[PDB]
Structures are given as structure tokens and as C-alpha cells.
């Protein structure tokens, strides 16, 4: 999949339908992979730079590949 956004996690939102939203760069994307949940909060808490990889590269797009640098 191609690189969509790279940057620190600005904020995360735990949605009602049990998905998880994240705000990196200017796009606000979400994932439905339960696993990525604690991994991203850790990322946001420590200030890690993350690359989210996705074709749906627009606010509201879904993703599942993240690089934790």
C-alpha cells in the first residue's frame, strides 16, 4: 500500500462501533483491527512518529498498515 501520512499522532478517538480513529498530519483515518488500538495510544503517548499506509488516503479513510518509527 502507499504512504498516506507521516507524523506524530495528534489525537485518537474510541468510536462506538468499536473502531479507532487517529489524526496524523491532516488526515483523520480509522482502523477496525482491534490490535492496533493500544499500539496507537502508546504511539501517541510517547510522541512516536508514525507512517500510516493506505489507499483510502482521505479524512474518513480506513487503514491497517502502520510503521512505528
Amino acid at each position: 500500500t502507499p504512504d498516506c501520512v507521516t507524523g506524530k499522532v495528534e489525537y485518537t478517538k474510541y468510536n462506538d462501533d468499536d473502531t479507532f480513529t487517529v489524526k496524523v498530519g491532516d488526515k483523520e483515518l480509522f482502523t477496525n483491527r482491534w490490535n492496533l488500538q493500544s499500539l496507537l495510544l502508546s504511539a501517541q503517548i510517547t510522541g512516536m512518529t508514525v507512517t500510516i499506509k493506505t489507499n483510502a488516503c482521505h479524512n474518513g479513510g480506513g487503514f491497517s498498515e502502520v510503521i512505528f518509527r
Binding site: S38, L41, A43, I45, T46, G47
Partner: protein
């Protein structure tokens, strides 16, 4: 407001850095051993800018003396360079309103962050090499620069001078490592290790946690880990006052927490305690 950085010998280099640290920071008697103290940037009496004049690249004759770096004080942001030849102070885009006495001013297309310098420069800090040769080169590049654009040559030249001035100023670890290629006759070269980089990314968080220090066995912040007081002083020489965006973490979100003789920054502790 005018300091010198002599690159003539590892001795003149190290002595230079020490003059500037005593001038802008005061010792925390809390973290001390061997007549070396951790210093804290005296941020109580306003922020100001100071010039750092690069001298000694060519120790033989001393031509390359027209480089001057403008440095912010409370966070040690390197706001840009000044070509003493035509006196134009080229400042980074994120400091569009900064000015220095005696100079006219030209704003560069890119900002100061490492993310940008590394893009434009085309290289990464980890594995980056530095010696008198690369420094002589980096001087000529900045000197022969005119214009608005942040060119690959300028970014590479700044990655290097920012490392040997500001980063070295903050970390004895980076000065110790680099120092020796100034006295080495064969022209080896210092290589910025991943540990050296990990250090630079944790200045804010360390500055925040370290004054909370009162003799714990160890201090852990991020990927950085210190086994004792000596491991600390051998690595960090200058920290921020967290009692021009401040480099300190956003008030009250990074507190040092001590458990079983080990001092942790709370963001790190919090992130690794989540078991699913």
C-alpha cells in the same frame, strides 16, 4: 551576545563549548560528581539571541572565518546563518520575524526542524559522518549561498553545523564523540550513532524529568537509559528550564515517577503498561 567556537584542536573546540555553557546556564548542585555539574539554561531573565562565530576550520592559515550562527537562548534553536561578507542573515522559515543587529535579512524556503533538513539534505542523521574535511566543505557551501531557497547543499551544511554546535552544546556525549576527529591526523571521521540520535530526540522529556532526580539508581526516559549519575553527566551537559515555541513538554503531562529506586518519565511508563 558574541561567542567563539574554535575548531582548531580538540582542546580549543571543547574549551569553546564550555565557555558558552557557563555563560548561559547555571549548575544544578543536585546532579554532580567529579567537579562536573549538570547545567540548566538560565531562562528566568528573558529570551535573547546570540551569535556564535565559527573559527578554526582551516587551522593552518585561518581563512574560513566569515561564518556566524544565530542562536536563540532558552531552547538553543539555531535560527540560521550570517555570511559576514555581505552581512545578510539567512534565517529559517519558522523564524520569519527574527532579526539580528547589524544585519539585513533573507528568509529561507524551508524550516529548521530535522524532518526538513533531512528531506532536503537527502540523508539521515543516523550514520551521518563529520570531520574537518566535511566541515570545510560545509562552510564553503553556506558562504557561496545567496538566495531564498533551502538547497540540498545548505541543508547538509546545517545538519552538520547544528550537530557540532547546538547538539554538542547540549550533550557531552556528542562532543566527546566528535572532538577526536580534530586531532586525528589521518582524517578518520565521527559517525553519529543511533544512540546519539536517540539522545537528541529526548531533550525535552529529559529536561523535564532530571531535576526530579535525588539519587535513584537509574533514570529511564524513552530509549535512553542511565545506570548511574556518571553515565548521566557523561552524556547530558545542558538542560532546559521547564519549571519561540518551548521545547518542554506541554505542562503537567511529563512528570518523573520513581519506583523501586528507578526514575521514569510518566509518558514512557504509561505507554508500556498497557497489556491487552
Amino acid at each position: 551576545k558574541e561567542f567563539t567556537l574554535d575548531f582548531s584542536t580538540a582542546k580549543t573546540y571543547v574549551d569553546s563549548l564550555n565557555v558558552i555553557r557557563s555563560a548561559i546556564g547555571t549548575p544544578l548542585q543536585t546532579i554532580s560528581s567529579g567537579g562536573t555539574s549538570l547545567l540548566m539554561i538560565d531562562s528566568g531573565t528573558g529570551d535573547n539571541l546570540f551569535a556564535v562565530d565559527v573559527r578554526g576550520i582551516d587551522p593552518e592559515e585561518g581563512r574560513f572565518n566569515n561564518l556566524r550562527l544565530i542562536v536563540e537562548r532558552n531552547n538553543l534553536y539555531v535560527t540560521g546563518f550570517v555570511n559576514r561578507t555581505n552581512n545578510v542573515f539567512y534565517r529559517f522559515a519558522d523564524f520569519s520575524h527574527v532579526t539580528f543587529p547589524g544585519t539585513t535579512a533573507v528568509t529561507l524556503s524551508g524550516d529548521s526542524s530535522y524532518t526538513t533538513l533531512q528531506r532536503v539534505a537527502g540523508i539521515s542523521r543516523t550514520g551521518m559522518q563529520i570531520n574537518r574535511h566535511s566541515l570545510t566543505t560545509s562552510y564553503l557551501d553556506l558562504m557561496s549561498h545567496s538566495g531564498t531557497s533551502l538547497t540540498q547543499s545548505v541543508a547538509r551544511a546545517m545538519l552538520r553545523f547544528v550537530t557540532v554546535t547546538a547538539e554538542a552544546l547540549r550533550f557531552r556525549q556528542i562532543q566527546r564523540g566528535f572532538r577526536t576527529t580534530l586531532d586525528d591526523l589521518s582524517g578518520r571521521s565521527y559517525v553519529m550513532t543511533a544512540e546519539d540520535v536517540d539522545l537528541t530526540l529526548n531533550w525535552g522529556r529529559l529536561s523535564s524529568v532530571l531535576p526530579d532526580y535525588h539519587g535513584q539508581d537509574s533514570v529511564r526516559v524513552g530509549r535512553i537509559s542511565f545506570g548511574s549519575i556518571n553515565a548521566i553527566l557523561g552524556s547530558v551537559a545542558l538542560i532546559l528550564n521547564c519549571h519561540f515555541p518551548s521545547m518542554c513538554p506541554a505542562d503537567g503531562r511529563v512528570r518523573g515517577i520513581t519506583h523501586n529506586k528507578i526514575l521514569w518519565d510518566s509518558s514512557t511508563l504509561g505507554a508500556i503498561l498497557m497489556r491487552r
